[PDB]
Point group: D2
Chain length 169, copies 4
């Protein structure tokens, strides 16, 4: 997680968020530097859960070529705020996951923040239904992040090159 001064911001989340349309495969396009993702080519796959919420399967390609994956569960603890989820990953304490913006069919912007006294730790990802996302969309989503304090100059661009990411089966 990206540790910075100041308490967590509280950005607005996707109005009328429909988890049913959010399921499926999302490709990581840009992200803040964090501790969890040590590689490239990252995807998140969200699938139906027989309980509440949905289930999570994230995969990425490490620099050595190994595919690393993690499973988790996603739950909206307050059903009146379906876009404010809590993610429970194997071997991890709970972390928030807020869908800030999505059209379900092309892009989403997701954000997570944990307070650390007078500082905070945040995740943030622009994701796409395809390995790429149009630059106009990326710029708009960067606009949203800057509005609530995210230094978009620290954003990392995720490698989704078809050849490099062919290790992703």
């Amino acid at each position: 997680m990206f540790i910075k001064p100041g308490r967590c911001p509280k950005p607005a989340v996707q109005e009328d968020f429909d988890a049913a349309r959010y399921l499926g495969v999302w490709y990581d396009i840009q992200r803040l530097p964090n501790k969890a993702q040590k590689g490239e080519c990252a995807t998140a796959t969200y699938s139906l859960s027989p309980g509440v919420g949905f289930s999570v399967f994230n995969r990425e390609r490490l620099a050595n070529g190994t595919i690393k994956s993690v499973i988790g569960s996603a739950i909206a603890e307050d059903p009146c705020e379906p876009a404010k989820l809590q993610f429970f990953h194997e071997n991890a304490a709970p972390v928030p996951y807020w869908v800030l913006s999505t059209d379900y069919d092309n892009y989403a912007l997701v954000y997570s923040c944990i307070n650390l006294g007078a500082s905070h730790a945040a995740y943030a990802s622009i994701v796409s239904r395809q390995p790429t996302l149009p630059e106009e969309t990326i710029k708009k989503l960067q606009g949203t992040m800057s509005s609530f304090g995210v230094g978009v100059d620290t954003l990392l661009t995720t490698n989704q090159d078809a050849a490099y990411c062919s290790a992703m089966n």
Copy 2:
């Protein structure tokens, strides 16, 4: 839940709790009065989840023969305390679910408490792998409950009569 004086107790939980062995069908035998269950013949079915934790399917037989069911997800938010679960039901805020005692194949004692200032609200249930449980076991588990202040005078016996509950299957 109904309200009793005092903050929540912190009873001991099942040592080395094994959620895989806890899965399957459990019959409600006795419980504290609460608002959630308005019927009889109650069962809880716990099943594999593709994410973390396990999935929840509770069923009961309402008085006009309807079978009311609720879905949920169960997660141990601290993996080092696997008997202290959080249950997320559709249309409910999160609630604790602590497995205080179980031999997995016959009985379990489950406890849930939420603080209300200087008072608290609790659920507590004796459950069985069969629609009945031996009086000796019931009495021992009531002893456990009384050791952290649960008045056994308040426990309701659930109707598990075979004829009455036949529509459950």
Copy 3:
């Protein structure tokens, strides 16, 4: 607190809440039935704290003339939401305290809610800088309460009779 169906509502809180102006003495005028206050003539006194937040001293007149008092501390855990406080009373778990509406010099409407699964427990109080409050103000504040589902049928009127409450001073 006593239990009502539904999860907690999230009513709007006093904009630009100024805790310095909120300090001093407040008289209980009307409130939801609860377990905490068993007496009449109730007042809350809020005072400067050398740390953060402010200090709490509640007093009431018990039926056998005893003046029961409780001490506490009030803290706005998120400084950006100063009207959403947490109250820490001696011998109580933390409880929310939301200033929904106040003009500081005449009236305030305070609300506290804790989720109990699909149900909730709430406190709600109309308070005044005087032992009485005009009927017009009381009626407006009941309107606010009814807008987030508080049944005004349930509100108790607090005894603030001057003769009866004389031992308060």
Copy 4:
């Protein structure tokens, strides 16, 4: 805060913790690297609160000679665990504060940890009633920290030199 892999540990805390004997001045002797303390000569002063808990006044000498201070409130949210406090500092989100070990008259060992998914952020301090602490005591307290995972090789020694710290009025 010191950000490291793994979830927070849960060390044992001081049995029978008596906040009344913990009040007064404590000198920082050794600490984990963190973001809050940017200087040396640090002291914490704990004083009586008219509410619950106690009030907090921390001071340190920056490298430029300026004295920097912060005020806060300390509260045991669960009165049955008086050694597990929550500290509310001005401009800061709440952070835990656990008194692991103290004899009140000479030393204390304090610990704070916040989970960050599969990682965590921790504070830890050895403090003394005097600007120094005997090496035998320091080694014992380092022994306690290593037992629950704290790499005592990362500990910083706080400058409490009488000349350098004379800026502390």
